């Protein structure tokens, strides 16, 4: 009854009455991925398949040319004990491994998060730091810039060299062409609607609304930069 239907009612982008997500140019959000709430995505940012990003409880900021990964859940907290803003902030060239969970945190530029990491609320990862795949950053913990940490709880290993930082930046830049290759496979016009069957509601609306404005106003002049656009 409530949940009985054959066609899924899932949308990648959603808002809660005031919280419209914003996505930059050349940014690919996978159809499986869900991005709901006050979420801002920068330019060339790629969110892979089956990743959830909820900015409903608080704002979420995502930098430019970052990779989020697969099966990654990013969400905010109501507040922090220190009184700091609880919004999620991620810098540029940040790579987040798959299976990872991000709480209200502050990730700076060129940070690399391994696969399956768990960063808890209040964590502050500085520029260039790296995290082992199966490590946990406890709440309110500061990871210094250009340092390597591993384990659960995370513990220091050694400092990172300019070569390692350059390699991380290069990988972040390299993800972009794969994202574009995935993007090119979708046409700007969705053809799924052509596969449905007319229903009574479709053929005769129950109630009518007053024509105010079409959301696709001027789309005959707008460029189809992102094929996955409503």
């Amino acid at each position: 009854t409530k949940y009985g239907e054959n066609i899924s009612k899932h949308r990648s982008l959603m808002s809660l009455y005031d919280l419209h997500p914003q996505i930059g140019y050349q940014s690919y959000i996978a159809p499986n991925s869900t991005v709901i709430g006050e979420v801002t995505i920068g330019n060339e940012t790629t969110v892979w398949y089956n990743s959830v990003i909820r900015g409903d409880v608080n704002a979420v900021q995502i930098g430019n040319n970052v990779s989020i990964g697969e099966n990654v859940v990013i969400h905010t907290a109501g507040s922090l004990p220190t009184g700091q803003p609880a919004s999620v902030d991620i810098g540029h060239y940040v790579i987040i491994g798959s299976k990872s969970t991000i709480y209200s945190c502050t990730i700076q530029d060129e940070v690399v998060i391994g696969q399956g990491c768990v960063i808890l609320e209040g964590a502050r990862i500085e520029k260039g730091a790296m995290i082992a795949a199966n490590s946990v950053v406890p709440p309110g913990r500061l990871i210094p810039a250009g340092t390597l940490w591993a384990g659960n709880p995370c513990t220091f290993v050694r400092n990172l060299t300019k070569s390692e930082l350059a390699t991380n930046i290069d990988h972040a830049k390299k993800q972009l062409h794969l994202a574009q290759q995935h993007r090119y496979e979708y046409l700007p016009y969705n053809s799924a609607y052509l596969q449905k069957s007319n229903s009574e509601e479709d053929l005769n609306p129950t109630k009518y609304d007053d024509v105010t404005i079409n959301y696709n106003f001027g789309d005959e002049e707008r460029a189809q930069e992102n094929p996955l656009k409503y």
Binding site: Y17, D18, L19, E38, N58, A59, G78, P85, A86, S87
Partner: protein
């Protein structure tokens, strides 16, 4: 909260501004004790207004 922009509701009530913004004592007083003033309390704002005048 529906129709209030970035304002969000807490456990015991709904805030009067965006999350990271500062709470306003004058607005709190207006809401809680609307139209009622036992005495003309001289706050920092009142003192500064007097000085400016």
């Amino acid at each position: 909260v529906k129709g209030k922009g970035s304002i969000r509701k807490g456990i015991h009530g709904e805030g009067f501004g965006a999350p990271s913004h500062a709470h306003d004592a004058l607005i709190h007083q207006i809401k809680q004790s609307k139209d009622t003033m036992d005495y003309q309390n001289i706050t920092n704002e009142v003192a500064q207004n007097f000085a400016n005048h």
